[PDB]
Amino acid sequence: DFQVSKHPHYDEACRAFAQRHNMAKLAERAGMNVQTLRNKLNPEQPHQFTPPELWLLTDLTEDSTLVDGFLAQIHCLPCVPVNELAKDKLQSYVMRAMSELGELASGAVSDERLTTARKHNMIESVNSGIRMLSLSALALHAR
Amino acid sequence: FDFQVSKHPHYDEACRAFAQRHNMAKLAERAGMNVQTLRNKLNPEQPHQFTPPELWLLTDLTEDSTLVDGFLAQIHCLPCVPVNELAKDKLQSYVMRAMSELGELASGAVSDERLTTARKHNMIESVNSGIRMLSLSALALH
Fold first, then answer.
1. Looking at the record's lineage, which domain of life comes first (chain B)?
2. Interface membership of A60 toward B (CB under 8 Å)
3. DSSP string, A58-118
4. CB count in 10 Å sphere of residue A52
5. CA angle B23, B27, B29 (to 5 degrees)
6. How far apart are CA B17 and CA A81, in angstroms?
7. Which of A20, A133, A19 is nearest to B132 (CA)?
8. Contacts of B8 in chain A (CB under 8 A)
9. Contact assessment for residue A79 and residue B81, using Cβ atoms and an 8 Å cutoff
10. B91 at the A interface (CB within 8 A)?
11. Cβ(A76)–Cβ(B131) under 8 Å?
12. Which residues contact B79 (CB under 8 A, 6 or more apart)?
């Protein structure tokens, strides 16, 4: 159930993001007036960033601090960047994601003391399965 | 982790899919906003955009992370993984929800007609939901 956090995670990240970079230099990078940028980043001011303005600042600074605070306000984990190229076919990512998923189900179906070796060994299947799914989306965008 | 802005309109296509997936009149009533304002902020050709509070609100009202996922895909980020309801006892439910998304992805993976525009985003939500269910499985292991 998606819910807004009871703490100001986003505005705390807006403040943290302000400490990490020069706002005057950043505003001149983005083409914004420095006061307009400071107010949209200031929890004291009702002005907010647009979704595209969040990417551009994220892209210009290479800093996920703002995006992580936006995500934390709805209990989302911080952004996990991806850098993937689909060499094979959409089909092939679907099938290989299930050696992972099947091995994930194999450890979850028998629930009696969850191991360290299995808890570890089921997480590659998660991480490898996630990689196959993200590769499925890119190969689906191709054709 | 270069957070490059994708050349594709991931976020614009997410707004279009979100606009067709929900009743705009009821959603605007629940969100306490004019239904015209909600349509304009969902239309890529309109200049009005959402605010962080509005994106949080629409995601909570609909339990649909399509807008957040499209936002994250624009900067090459994985879809959102909410830890609000994370529980160790829900591992089996996380796993079983993955085939619903993967079986849907597999249904469209094999030869089925041609290139729609709705049931391919449809497969993108299955990838996103499958990624979220896999992530919550790894988190539930603790």
1. Viruses
2. no
3. HHHHT--HHHHHHHHTTTBPPP-B------S-HHHHHHHHHHHHHHHHHHHHS-SS--HHH
4. 14
5. 125
6. 23
7. A133
8. 141
9. no
10. yes
11. no
12. B65, B68, B69, B72, B73, B128, B129, B131, B132
The letter for the amino acid at A54 is L
**What CA–CA distance (Å, rounded) separates B101 from A16?**
37
CA nearest to B8, candidates A141, A86, A84: A141
The C-alpha atoms of residue B30 and residue A97 are separated, in whole angstroms, by: 39
Q: What is the dihedral of CA B64, A134, B114, B62, to 10 degrees?
A: 0
Least CB–CB distance from A51: residue in B11, B83, B106: B11
Domain map (residue ranges) of chain A: 9-72, 90-142
**Residue A21 has what DSSP assignment?**
S
Give the length of chain B.
142
Burial class (CB in 10 A: 0-12, 13-18, 19+), A59: middle
Residues shown for chain A: 143
Burial A102-141 (b: 16+ CB within 10 A, else e): ebbbebbeeeeebeeebeeebbebbebbbbbbbbbbebbe
Can you read off the two tokens belonging to residue A39?
A: 């107010």
Angstrom resolution of this structure: 2.2
**B87 in contact with A at a CB cutoff of 8 Å?**
no
